[PDB]
Amino acid sequence: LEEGKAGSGLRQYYLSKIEELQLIVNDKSQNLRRLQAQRNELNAKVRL
């Protein structure tokens, strides 16, 4: 292919590098989603 299946992997590498980068940013969001739901449940605790 030479355009190509060797280059497209490097193209797919960029996405997977950003996907892992996004997963790192997502991992930064995922544990931060807990800090919300926690305080969101604590926002229900003051209402409890």
Binding site: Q36, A37, N40, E41, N43, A44
Partner: protein, 653 residues
Amino acid sequence: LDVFEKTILESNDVPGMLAYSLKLCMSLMQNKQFRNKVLRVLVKIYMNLEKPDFINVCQCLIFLDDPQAVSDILEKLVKEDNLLMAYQICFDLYESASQQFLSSVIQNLRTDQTLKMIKILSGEMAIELHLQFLIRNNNTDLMILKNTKDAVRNSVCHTATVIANSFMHCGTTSDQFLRDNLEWLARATNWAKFTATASLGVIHKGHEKEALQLMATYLPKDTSPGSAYQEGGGLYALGLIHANHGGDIIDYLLNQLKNASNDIVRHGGSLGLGLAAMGTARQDVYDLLKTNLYQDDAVTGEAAGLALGLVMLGSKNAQAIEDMVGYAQETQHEKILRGLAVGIALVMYGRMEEADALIESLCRDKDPILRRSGMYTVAMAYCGSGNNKAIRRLLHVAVSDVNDDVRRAAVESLGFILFRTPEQCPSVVSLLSESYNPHVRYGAAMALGICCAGTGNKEAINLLEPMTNDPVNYVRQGALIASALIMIQQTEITCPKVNQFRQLYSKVINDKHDDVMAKFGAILAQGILDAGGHNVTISLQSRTGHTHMPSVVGVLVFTQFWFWFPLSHFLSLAYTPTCVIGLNKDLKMPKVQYKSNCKPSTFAYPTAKAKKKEKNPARVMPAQLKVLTMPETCRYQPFKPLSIGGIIILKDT
């Protein structure tokens, strides 16, 4: 598009590489600008290729929406004189193309093969073939229906059972709960008897012939019953049957609008005429809908707005919204604002750009209902796309806004737009499930209910498990309907939670200590699972690719029926027939039996080889379409490869 022409013209094969790429490109393409430009040059090289392929013209028919191009392709098929090969695009143009495109193609084509095209676009023969499918595959169970009947609750029971049996009784036209108890239906009053003549049109949906003379007992003009709300549902009853395609009943509605009941006739009358003219872009219906908008009455305001978005759907009428949103400021009622909220929302669909001009006005305004209008408007406009510009303001109104009802309708728009990729909804709506206010959780549960209804995803069932455990009563009810949409047509062999939820629906309703509110959606969750006798499903994503208008309009009106009870009886819009057909051609019914690898456990409605019709047709699950193989020993064998459902051609050897 230059080098693309060389890539599609490359030698050898590439047998299907042009076929599935259009399915892949449609999903990954952000800008539709040059998308169809790639498609229009692709369908040309299909015809230039030696082997004709009719699945390519199916895709460009809806996307290019050119009435002059669709007229010339069949005009050649008329000269080609073979009705077998054109029989695929005959019903494909029917089930796929909307009412606006059907009215344009029917005119240029009809100007044998001329009589054959009449019933395909009007759906005449298409109703009866699936009318005979229902009565066969339908398996009635009266046990659970009686288990919810003996609660003996004076209210909320009259609305619950008549809408629950209409689920499993879809299209069978039979009369059962009317004949068995006369006195119990007489106990109903106010808007409850509105459903008796309404749910009568549900079970009778389809069957375009007898729908006139059978309901003559409920005629508002001649009978004039003591309760005025009983005679107001006769107009809305036939609108169900007459959704999309119309008929002679257009005069039947004209006779009952000018006599007897006023203005509650305009309630069921405009919804009956508006749903019948839905997609047709009719004029005279818009004329009498403006004076119904100015009647100033709050209850009739819903009928004026809801019927106006129907008829003008896809047309994008300028004067419609101008008279609607122009009346929204000085009106004193919320219900006129509601029907108008969906009214301006129903007219704008799938544009992705033009509708954004109104979206800026809706959400920015301080009217609580008009902010709900922006969410139903941005949903239908963005329906079928994952655009990141809509989710921006979607969360901002779902959080920063003080009103809880608009936060609900805000998260409900995620199920309308994202149904193409339902896997994304459980992730984005996850964090919204911990909201302290149950109003958001009611819509959060619905977002997984409406979007994932067709899918068999078990994760949505897992997320809906704590939803019915929440102390709030209506979030439990919202969890019952949503968890009933995920299991449609799916039995215990699919997911183990089936029998767990089925016993819970009858449990809570037979328990008097539980709230009457939540237990209304209990038996209704049964019926949702039993809808059409488990025969028919509801799918917004199909090979056709178009959204399903009556189910969305019906379920969005059924979101909150606590403002007006007819909105609970307007759930009758969610009832639609669907099936597959093995008919070869014309009126001749072939005898064909082919094997299936799935057990009767899926066929049970509370292996080596199976037996399927042989057109009445036989049932199939969307998951069972891949495991079935066309019979090699039959005299009648299909010329087209059989993969997904729908009516396909069958060639005689």
